[PDB]
Amino acid sequence: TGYDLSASTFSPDGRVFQVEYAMKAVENSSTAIGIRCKDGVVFGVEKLVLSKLYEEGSNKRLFNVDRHVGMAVAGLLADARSLADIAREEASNFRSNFGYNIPLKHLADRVAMYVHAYTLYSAVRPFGCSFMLGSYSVNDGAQLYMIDPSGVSYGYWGCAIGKARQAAKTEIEKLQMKEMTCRDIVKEVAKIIYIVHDEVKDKAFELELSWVGELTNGRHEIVPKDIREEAEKYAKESLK
Amino acid sequence: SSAGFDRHITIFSPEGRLYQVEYAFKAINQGGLTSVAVRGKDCAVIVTQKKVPDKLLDSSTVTHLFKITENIGCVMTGMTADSRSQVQRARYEAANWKYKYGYEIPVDMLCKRIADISQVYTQNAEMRPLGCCMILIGIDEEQGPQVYKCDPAGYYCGFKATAAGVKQTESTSFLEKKVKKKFDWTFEQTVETAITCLSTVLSIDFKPSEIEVGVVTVENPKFRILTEAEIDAHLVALAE
Amino acid sequence: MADGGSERADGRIVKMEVDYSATVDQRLPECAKLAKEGRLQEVIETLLSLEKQTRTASDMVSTSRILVAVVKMCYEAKEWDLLNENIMLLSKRRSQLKQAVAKMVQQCCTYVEEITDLPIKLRLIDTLRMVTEGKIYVEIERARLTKTLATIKEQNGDVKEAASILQELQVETYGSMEKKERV
Amino acid sequence: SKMNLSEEVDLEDYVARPDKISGADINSICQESGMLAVRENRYIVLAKDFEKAYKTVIKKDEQEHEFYK
């Protein structure tokens, strides 16, 4: 042993077990999914109810970086909201320096470099977080990026992280995101997490949905209550 | 062979070795990729494959080709998180060259600077040497095209044919047989040999969607990336 | 498959005498694309019977007229080039050279009676290239014997061409199991 | 001295190259190349069989990591 302590020591076959351990801690976070529709991006977070003593609307795993940029996280909540702080501050540097809104390709580049900065030293640890970023532009369409604990990002028509990663993304590809205007995306995105985290594992869960596009006028906000009540209306047709 | 912490940090072995960097060489081979570059008589061709496993992932966001400057492009092998950071360093150093000197940097000078930065990580006993490789091209006055490869160890040299990745030794064994006949090489000759190199070593006979080709030519010295249409034109031109 | 070459041969046997062999050179690539596959066993054999037969028809035009000495080394050099165009050693080299090159030296077995010493030794160097693999390795023998004899028959029996037989005596005892004519 | 070896094939081009060659493996060089000519159905050995058979036998990459020197 001894080859798996620092973030500066390779393995004898040449890798880092620390980053793999922090990646292993991601699959104990519950589930964070999100796809882009034809004309917008919809995030989806299911949220476990630990005790009844918590208030509804507590400790949200769904963030809001810019007026248009949205964030959904999966990992350690403190490090996640820390990354939301430096990313939000970074977009404030972009608008403060250049005078317009940051694109996702630049933003995820800067955030990913900041994550990669903590992958080199014995003085710091890697983050135990992974998260998804997506927003809409009227000049650039809609984007959808995801960032691992190591600091590698990609574009996606859809992505899924949490416990049931493969058991979530297996059903996402049944959809047709290339044409659906996210109206029905709300119901289907609701259903593909309705079919997971059974009553054996979970006592009770909570739906938490985010929503952005030019139907949202470009601005990012949460879903209204009536639409997700139509999603919960769309819930119990999965028993057939 | 070993004593102390030469299995852990960047110090000397009793044999005079140092195990960390040669651990980091096969970290490139953990990327699962192999790239080929060929210098022509008046041109230079970079070619490598790409693997898009899912329809949910954006195929336009997997490019390992990177435009450093208006007349300098490069390809990255190894791991993505280190590779993109090294690209950022290369862009920054090239811009600082142009500010301090008012003309375009020579590609051997740039690769020299990147090798000097890479020297520091194995030079100290603190930092994790970036496990990713580096390959560049460049058109130079009174030199034409020229190709350089920078390793994570800080060594670099000008090549004539260039292979890097998993199938590297076999590909170089092909290319030395290709170059030892010493034929004068035109554009599509270099393209055809470049494609048949990894096409015969990897033995794929692909369709034009799984690869990417960057090129530069003495006529139009701009670094450009090929369209899959003209890639198919060279492909069926290669299929006699 | 085979009927395609049968109907191109059907469509072009008129064009052998009437048309010039540059279109035969424009039939070698397509029948060479048939020489790529050979999807069935006997088909490409029956093809190269026909196209190597029309090369002998280009002998029945070319080596019948004066167009001989240049077009021979045009012919067998692109026959060996045909041995490395698509598949190596005439694509398959099974059941298909026996009807090809034995027929080439059958034609030039009927032109060794015909043509004089100025191109016929060029025909000899065109057939002594098939020694190491081509002519006598599978089925041919007893056709080399009368032309290495004919090398003696040019001067009618000197010492040195009579000594030039020694290169081919002991080896092809292995080449064909036969008890009388080889002896 | 026992094969056919065509007319032209140089040996000293293979003699002059360095690295750990044994006394046993040369028999596998000429032997395997002879098997390659038999595979090609050609009773006289050419140079390409030697060039394929040599790299077929030797099989070592560089073991160097050239920046050491």
Next chain:
Amino acid sequence: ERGYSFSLTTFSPSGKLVQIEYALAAVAGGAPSVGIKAANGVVLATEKKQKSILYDERSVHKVEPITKHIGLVYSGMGPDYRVLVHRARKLAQQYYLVYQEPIPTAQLVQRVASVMQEYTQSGGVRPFGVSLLICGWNEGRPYLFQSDPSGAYFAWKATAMGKNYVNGKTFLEKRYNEDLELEDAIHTAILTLKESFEGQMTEDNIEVGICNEAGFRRLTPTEVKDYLAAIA
């Protein structure tokens, strides 16, 4: 960030600096080279084999000039060389800005050796793994110095480093004397490189630079091929 602020090299109970002892083995595994001074200038010669035919030998170099009249070669590993090369390139300029005079070679060796000893004592770094050969004809007389990873230096008449230098120094002992010429040192330098060279010694298996009263320069493969020609 910040470093470690402790030296990773201590004294043994036998009283030895073990990392420097290993660094000398890393120098001993390096490429062989030699250098000879004879009565007009110094000849440095190295042994440079490309690992394959795919390389450009005209790209990188072993013989490196430092000023108008000082060249330098090594016998060791690659990337550690260029750094202290660039350091010495700076140090000659910080001499020249003060004094408006080309630097004495010994005064260069003082500063470079001080850099190496300071670096092997400074905290949290492995020491260098090369040894150098330094040439130059300052004030008429040529000079030839050799450093080490420990930071010392010597004033050699002629010596060799790299591989089989224990044989090469015997060959130079049975070869050289005081009275020679530059081309004679060239010829016996090609001889002592041929003592341990590979089978073929072409124009690009080596790299040779020379000093004169005219100063330091570096050869081209034309006359280097003419030096390997009519040799051995």
